[model samples]
Target: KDMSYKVIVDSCGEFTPEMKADGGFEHVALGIQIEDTQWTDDDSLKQEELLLKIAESTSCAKTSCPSPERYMESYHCDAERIYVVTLSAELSGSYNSAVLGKNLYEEEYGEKQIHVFNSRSASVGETLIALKVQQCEKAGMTFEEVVESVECYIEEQHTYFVLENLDTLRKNGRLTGIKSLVALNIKPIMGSTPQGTICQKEKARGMKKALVKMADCVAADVVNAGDKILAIAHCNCEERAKEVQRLLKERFAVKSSFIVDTSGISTVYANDGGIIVVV
Candidate 1:
C-alpha cells in the first residue's frame, strides 16, 4: 500500500525491545537473540541491570549473533524485496548469516530480490543505513537502486566514539594501550575501520576533551554529504551525550539528530560513559 511503510527492528544479541515506541514501524517483531559469553545464568536480566555486570566484569566478552536460519526465516515474508542491514562483518557474524540466508533463499526462489549489507559500523551506524533504506523505498527506488545507494551511504558514512571507560574495549581486545593511556588518565578518540576493526585515532588528556575532539573531527572532515543526520548513542551518559549533540549541531549542517541508549550488545563493548556517533 502506498499509504504504509513498515519496518522491524531486532538485534544479534540481548537488546532493549522498544521498536513499538519508535512510531515509524507499522509492524514490530523482535525475537532475535543475543548471548553473553561471560554470563549464561538467567534470561531475566533487564537491560539496565545487565549493564552493571557488563561494566564490572573483567571476563573475555563475546556475543552470539543471529544465525543464518534465523535470517532465512525472516526472509520468508510476503515482501518481494528484502534489505537486511547488519553490523560490521569484521566485528559481527550476523552479516555472514544474513548473506548466507539470502543465498539459501535465492537457491529455492531465484526470483526474489534480497540483499545483506555489512554496515561496517554498528548501533546508530546500522540505524542510519536502515533509515536510508526506508527513505529510498518510500521514494520509489527500484530494489537495485536502493541497494546501490545504501551501499554507497555505508561507504561514505563516518563512525566515531569516545570511550569514557576503557575496560570493556580493553577486555574485548579492541584497545591497544593500557599502561600508557589508562595509567596516565588519558582517553583515546577512536573510529571504526571500513571493515569494522577498532583502531585508535586521537588522544586527549581527559574524556571531556575526547568528546569535543570527536565532534570536531566529524564536523571538520565529513566528505561529500548532501544532507546529513547525526546519530548519537550512549551508555548511561545523557549529560555528556547532550554536549556532543550540541557540538555537532553547532559545528555542522546536521538535518536531524537521534539519541539512543546503548542496548546490551553495544553496552558489552561501549560500557558506561561511552558515546558512539554516526553521521
Candidate 2:
C-alpha cells in the first residue's frame, strides 16, 4: 500500500539526528541560505546535498526563508501540508519572512492549509520542535492537528543558553543597545527568561561558574513533571556541554537528553564555546 502525507521544515529542521547520522531523512524540506554565512562548511554542503537528494526522492521541496517569493513558488508548486519552522523571532527575520509567505500562499490557494511557526528559539530548540512535528506527521495526524500540536509545544517550551562572549550578539545587533556598551567588560552569560525574552545576562567569573548558573536556572525554572526532555546544543563546546548535562542529570535526573552542535545560522551567534540548554 502506498501512503502519502507531506511535512516541510525551514532552515532549522535541516539538522536532525537522522540528518546527522545517515545524511538523509524522508518527508522533510530544508530552507535555503542566500547570504554568505560562515556556518556552511564542506560537511554542511554535503549535508545539504543529502537533504536535497531526500527532497527529490520524497517529493519534498527545499527553498530559502529570506526569499519568500521563492518559498511561495515551492509551496504553490507542491501544495502539500506545509510547516515552516522558522528561527527565533528574537534572533532572526526568518520567522517574519515565513509568515509573509504563508499569508501570500493562503491568499492564492485559499482555506489556509499552510502553517508557519515562530519558534521564539533557535538552533536545536527549533530542530526539536520540527522533530516533534515530523513525529506527528508520521503518526498520520492531519495537517491542522500537527500544526496545533507543534504550536502547543512551542508555547510551553523554554530555551536558555550561555555565550562565551557578547561579540556575536553585538555584531548581530541582538544585544540591547545600552547593554552593548557594558558588555565590553562583562563576559556574557545569556538565557531566555520565562517571558521568552533572551535578555537575561550575567557577569560570571568564568565559564565553569556560568555553566553552573545556567544549570541552576534551568532546574529552578523548567517544569519537571512527566517526560521532560532536556536538549543541549553547543558550538564546538562538547566538554562544557557534557558538564552542563552532568549537572542536569545529577540534580534533576533528566534521563531524556540530547546534545547537538549548533549548525548553520546558529554558529553565527553562538561561537565555539557557546552553550544552549532547552526544555
Candidate 3:
C-alpha cells in the first residue's frame, strides 16, 4: 500500500478474486466494505471458498457499508491528494460516510484535500473510476488537475447490464411481475442512470436474446463516446461475459476490455448469470 500518492476507498468489491488479480495501486491502497452474504456447499475450505459461498447465495443478504471512521482512516496517508469513490450515494450510505470523513479530515488537516465521488455506479463501474484516478496520477498531473479530470469522467460514464435469475430481477423491480418473469425465464435488460438508480430498458424471452437487446441499446449510444474501454463483470458466468465482450467489440472502437468475476455484493445484484458493463 503506497501512501506516497493516492488510494481508492470503495464498497463491496475488493473482496473478490477478480479484484485481487488486477493488482492494486502501487501508491494507492483500497478501502472497502461487506455489502452481502450467505451460501455454502463445501465442508473443507480456504479463503476463496468462503467468498464463493457468498457469491453462490440465493438467500436474503444485506450491505454493511464502511463507517465514517474507516473513511477517515483511509485518508491518513502521506499523499496530499485523496480520492474517495463509492457506490451511488442514492444506492448506499457509503458516499455520505466518505463525505463526512473528508470533512472531518479537512477540519483537522486544512492543507490536505480529500475529494469524494458519488460513482453513480458500482462494481466494475467503481473499478473503472479508480483506474481513471491512477491514470491521471501517473501522468503527473497536479493534484487539482487529477481530481478535476476524474470528476468530469464520472459525469460522462453510464452502466448497462443483462440480468438472469428470478431473485436478481425481482430485487430491483416492484416484484409484482416477478412470477410471470420466472415462468417465461425472462431476462431483463437494465441500465443505471447517471444518478446511479437502476432502470429497466426492456425484457427479453431468454438470456441470449437479452444480451443482444442490451448491446443494441449500448451500441447506438456509445457512438458519441469516442474511444472507450469496456469493463465487464460477471457473476460466475465467464462464458456469457466473454460472449457479451465479443458482441460489444464488434459494435464499438473498444481500446481494451476486462472481464472479472463479480464479487459478493455484485453477486447480490448480478445473481449467478448476470453481466454488468460500463462502456
Clashes (backbone N, CA, C under 3 Å), per candidate, total 1, 2, 0
The TM-score-based order of candidates, best leading, equals 1, 3, 2
Q: List model 2 lDDT by residue over 1-279, tens digit each.
A: 222333444555336566455312222233333332222322335444433343344232223336566456645643356666766776666677677777777778765466777878877777777677777877889988898888888877777788765565665466663354343234555766443457765556567777777777777766652466678887767888899999887668663787876654555456557788888
**Prediction RMSDs, each to the true structure:** 4.2, 7.7, 5.0
Q: With candidate 2 superimposed using the best TM-score fit, by how many Å does residue 108's alpha carbon deviate from the native?
A: 4.3
User: In candidate 3, what are the lDDT values of residues 82-165, reduced to their tens digit?
Assistant: 777787776677788888888877777655767887888877778778778878888989878988998888887888887665
Off by over 4 Å in 3: 1-4, 13-59, 166-182, 223-226
On a 0 to 100 scale, what is the lDDT of residue 244 in model 1? 92
Per-residue alpha-carbon lDDT of candidate 1 for residues 194-257, written as tens digits (9 for 90 to 100): 7677777788887878888898888877864338767888888988899999887777776777
lDDT of each: 0.69, 0.62, 0.67
Candidate 2 differs from the real structure by a C-alpha RMSD in angstroms, to one decimal, of 7.7
User: lDDT for model 2, on a 0 to 1 scale?
Assistant: 0.62
Candidate no. 3 TM-score: 0.81
Determine which window of 10 residues in candidate 3 has minimal summed lDDT: 25-34
